[PDB]
UniProtKB/Swiss-Prot annotation, chain B:
Ranges annotated as spanning the membrane: none
Active site per the UniProt annotation: 77
Record keywords: FAD, Flavoprotein, Nucleotide-binding, Oxidoreductase
Record family assignment: Belongs to the flavin-dependent halogenase family. Bacterial tryptophan halogenase subfamily.
Miscellaneous: The reaction between FADH(2), Cl(-) and O(2) produces hypochlorous acid (HOCl), a powerful oxidant. HOCl is proposed to react with an active site lysine to generate a chloramine intermediate, which chlorinates the substrate. However, studies with the tryptophan 6-halogenase ThaL (AC A1E280) suggest another model: the conserved lysine would not form a chloramine intermediate, but it may protonate HOCl during the halogenation reaction.
Protein name: Tryptophan 7-halogenase RebH
Residues holding FAD: 11, 13-14, 37, 39, 47-48, 195, 346, 359
Gene that encodes it: rebH
């Protein structure tokens, strides 16, 4: 028979996302309960997202962007801005000078146009390599950088959208919002209780969960949203966790939230990823405040050193500033789903938030869970395919992230040097090989915005694509060995591409002149 | 420095396709010569194709469908009709009875509708498993079977397309067309001569090709289109061919062209794949003629037996009917491209034409070749990526075709029983497991037709998709173990699905009444 009963263990963000998505997907055909025990609450230190959060998650739920944004005090994200990844020095919020300008580059959500079937990146590098341009890749190929430099809104005062964007918010507010939504609109049962004992049967499946009050919860399917502890997937099911520290040295964070006077300084329409001596710091602007965290490697800095260098960066008192000290569990389970137990969220996998993938990993996995939905016979092929989708989503992100450090030119601290001594995974070395040979890496099948950020399957298959790779690699200074050989056979195309770079320049100038500041737009809403 | 000179060796279908495509892609920036020896030419036994022949090949060349179709006396293909794959007996052109009707099923180019993000196949099976319908998958889910039963045109008299379609033609005619195009409009040099000696250098790359007349041709890149011989890739470069007869028993054919009275019988808008005792037989309708070929396994039938059983099927006289007897090389090179030598066509790989992939393999490889186009330094990464794309293209097709034989329920001859004793490749076994578990296999990311058969990278990535698997597997009688578990959680979706089946029944009925016969349309 069908799954009748689902027990979600863990509240927080993944828990209530799971409750909401499953509540919606299976509405009226399964009874869902979430077990949540109270925890020491943390500061809201900020979460950055990607555009398909609206199209894959909130639209699936039937929640308009305006409804959730209002309740979560959200702001807009047009790009990640990478600061000081190429220059030596202390951890500072000001960009250093590099070749006549600030040491920054953007990874934005813009689409990279094709010209005559070839991505603009390849024409850019062709001209760069032959000294016909010295303009950075991101300024040449995307309208976004010029308007991000001026803190522009991604929407006009009349509401019309000029660029792809996503969101900055306090995760706690979003979890709250979803808890209200699941319990009130979807009849998800909320039980405040603490897991004391997980009972397994002779097949290794979870039979039930007994709580500290002595209540027993049985279900056909268990969803582990307990975070790093992995109370079901690791403690009960004994599934091993794969530590990825031969690829990823960062395992810790110190974080806080800082009041901000938006009236005096405006709001930045981007996340900042500020390179540090032994890691990097996020800055996630919200309304009246920003979230910030130094992600660092315990192998290269003590907790005290990280605290001191994070506080000094922001001119905060390390003795009195409210701080979150976090030790992460980096990596993934050998298998995300085992028996009748599916892990979702950090109980499944975690990588540092360098590319804003944390929330995405939750709803991407829920999408895959519903796609591979079992009945009570729990057909093993469903479980196996789900696992393969999760493993690829994680490993590809792990690789992509590793490359941000591996290809930094910095040699100034033990941390930056040690990153160059790690190996890239085989699959990543293959992409780098291709990239050096002038190939696109996972070119999107279409340069259409909507078809990509609006159709989840397409986006899941092609999650890190050529645009993403060139932003990061060319950003850091890794470029191909020579221009794509095809281009020498396309003289007309290399002439006419001039008008494509020109149309980018025009949009850059026109948007810079007509767009209001992000702050101007936010005040109008509120 | 860039590739300045290309030598194509061999000038049949693949050679002239290669000449046209490269001549177009590299126009004015590379000198191309084609070398072709006068061979005993074969009967035109017919070729069936898939819709992206227009969008990925002829469109690339800038040649309208009307131009080439008229010059190659082409006809229209809407589907492959599989006949007698489920019933015991002799090789006959007429479908036997099975469960109250003819033993046939269609594999159409039509698109399978999604309903509530789920392919129609899944709702069909759910209804079928629960005894709500006895209707075959193809008639439930596609408008095509009903209009194909009546030999309807895929275009109205006014020109409007009512369904996806491809083409039937004599390859010899298209190749001529392409020869005229490459030579007259793209400056490709045609040399009629035989290869006598291929000289290689110290790195093992081809330095030059010397001919029987003593002429010496050098190039930066060599394209082997020499067919099964592999004069360059296998013989000169010594790249091993990988035989794949552990997945595919068929290795031979007896083929001919049969005159056809279109005025009396009409023209079938489909290729027929007619199951035989020791293989299967294609029927490819053209204008006033059909191409036909018995594809068979030499391990199960002698050439004589095949000849007799093929001639008896079509009421031909074996003593006087012109026949081609072919022995195929089944499989692919270990690597399609080695050093400065790229194989394109049957010099590269071959599988029986059960799913009309032969021409597709040429332009698909040509597309990949241009995408991974080298300079004179022959970056090893471009070569390896190209090789990987060819392996996958080929192996996926090999697997899909094996499935046509492995899941046939026939046990009446040694040939049908021996197919069941082969192994499916690990990738294919995984797909079958997924299918049984109620999953879509390689569902199209989009429900949309144009975006699929009109964007090559999209179709290459997703070439055998869920629609194809269901057509063939459900056609043959392999269906999932139980309905997709999701559907029991979608009561509103399984209710509203009825008006989707209804809409198909409607289009069936409507087009059956309003469409001209294919005969009618061709005459125009």
């Amino acid at each position: 028979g069908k799954i009748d009963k689902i027990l979600i263990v863990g509240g927080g963000t993944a828990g209530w996302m799971a409750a909401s998505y499953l509540g919606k997907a299976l509405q009226g055909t399964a009874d869902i309960t979430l077990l949540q025990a109270p925890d020491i609450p943390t500061l809201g230190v900020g979460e950055a997202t990607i555009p398909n959060l609206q199209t894959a998650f909130f639209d699936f739920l039937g929640i308009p962007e305006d409804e959730w944004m209002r309740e979560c005090n959200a702001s807009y994200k047009v790009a990640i801005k990478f600061i000081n990844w190429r220059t030596a020095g202390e951890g500072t919020s000001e960009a250093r000078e590099l070749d006549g300008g600030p040491d920054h580059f953007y990874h934005s959500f813009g689409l990279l146009k094709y010209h005559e079937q070839i991505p603009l990146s390849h024409y850019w590098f062709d001209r760069s390599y032959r000294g016909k341009t010295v303009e950075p890749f991101d300024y040449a190929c995307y309208k976004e950088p010029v308007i991000l430099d001026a803190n522009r809104s991604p929407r006009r005062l009349d509401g019309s959208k000029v660029t792809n964007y996503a969101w900055h918010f306090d995760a706690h507010l979003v979890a709250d919002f979803l808890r209200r939504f699941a319990t009130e609109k979807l009849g998800v049962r909320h039980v405040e209780d603490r897991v004391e004992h997980v009972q397994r049967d002779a097949n290794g499946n979870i039979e039930s969960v007994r709580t500290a009050t002595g209540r027993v919860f049985d279900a056909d399917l268990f969803v582990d949203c307990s975070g790093f502890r992995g109370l079901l997937i690791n403690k009960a099911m004994e599934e091993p966790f794969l530590d990825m520290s031969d690829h990823l040295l960062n395992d810790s964070a110190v974080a806080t939230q800082v009041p901000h006077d938006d009236d005096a300084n405006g709001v930045e329409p981007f996340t900042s990823a500020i390179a540090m001596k032994s890691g990097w710091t996020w800055k996630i602007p919200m309304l009246g405040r920003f979230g910030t965290g130094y992600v660092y490697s315990s192998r290269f800095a003590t907790e005290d050193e990280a605290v001191r260098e994070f506080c000094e960066m922001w001119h905060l008192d390390p003795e009195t500033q409210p701080l979150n000290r976090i030790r992460f569990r980096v990596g993934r389970n050998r298998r995300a789903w085992v028996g009748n137990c599916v892990s979702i969220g950090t109980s499944s996998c975690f990588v540092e938030p360098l590319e804003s993938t944390g929330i995405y990993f939750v709803y991407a996995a829920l999408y895959q869970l519903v796609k591979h939905f079992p009945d009570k016979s729990l057909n093993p092929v469903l479980t196996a395919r789900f696992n393969r989708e999760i493993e690829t989503m994680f490993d590809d992100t792990r690789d992509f992230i590793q490359a941000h450090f591996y290809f930094s030119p910095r040699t100034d601290t033990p941390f930056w040097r040690a990153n160059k001594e790690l190996r890239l995974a085989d699959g990543m070395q293959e992409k780098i090989d291709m990239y050096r040979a002038g190939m696109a890496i996972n070119a999107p099948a279409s340069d259409d915005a909507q078809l990509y950020y609006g159709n989840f399957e397409e986006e899941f298959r092609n999650f890190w694509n050529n645009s993403n790779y060139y932003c990061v690699l060319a950003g850091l200074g890794l470029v191909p060995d020579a221009p794509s050989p095809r281009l020498a056979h396309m003289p007309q195309a290399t002439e006419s591409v001039d008008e494509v770079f020109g149309a980018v320049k025009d949009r850059q100038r026109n948007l810079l002149e007509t767009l209001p500041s992000l702050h101007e737009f936010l005040r109008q809403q509120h």
